[PDB]
Design a protein that fits this description.
Heme Oxygenase, Chain A; binds protoporphyrin IX containing FE; ALL alpha protein; oxidoreductase; monomer; mainly alpha; globular; 71% helix
Amino acid sequence: QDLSEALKEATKEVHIRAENSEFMRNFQKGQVSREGFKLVMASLYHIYTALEEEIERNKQNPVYAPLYFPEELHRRAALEQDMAFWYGPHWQEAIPYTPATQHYVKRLHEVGGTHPELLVAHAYTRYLGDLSGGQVLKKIAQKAMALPSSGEGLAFFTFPSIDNPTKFKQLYRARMNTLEMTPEVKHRVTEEAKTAFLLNIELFEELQALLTE
Ligand code: HEM
């Protein structure tokens, strides 16, 4: 079975759980506040910073390299734009770095530094989601918060080097399926993708509690 399929199958249950965290339930209903949106975007800033650091570290490593698409996919620059928008010109000292965010970053560094053959799990979990369900969440955030179509404040959700997310996502899948796979690697990849999803659930659980306080 192709890696792209094995990952979708392995994570379909946990994906249902992630969508039904209280934070994402409220988000999907159009209930997201500026405060709650700033917290989740700042946390994604740290997460994608760490993810992309480890991507760069491993760009030439054949357990990752066929998925090296910085121009198309990488989000750090976009997230920097969004931080300036939501937090102002001194955003680097204003933004929070929550403990659940720290925990996700920690595991990203463990994977990139000691288990790079699992980095595909983390890239899959973030980028493929960003290219599908992320586009729906974009439209909901725009409507909730009166964000302009010109795209300010939502750079994270915009892929100006990808014409068509559906076709790109098919290419990314196809390339995933060229990675050298053994039963060992494949089983651990799908396990790590479940962990990536849990790390996101745990963030959303944390941010909700911070917001409810
Ligand atoms: C309310 C929150 C969310 C909604 C409404 C949502 C919605 C979607 C939708 C409509 C798809 C396309 C499904 C398909 O093509 O069959 C999708 C795919 C995906 N989503 Fe989400 N999602 C949400 C949260 C998440 C979270 C929190 C993650 C991980 C952090 C995530 C990761 C993914 C991944 C990796 C895929 C690709 C599945 C694949 O094609 O292999 N999503 N999502």
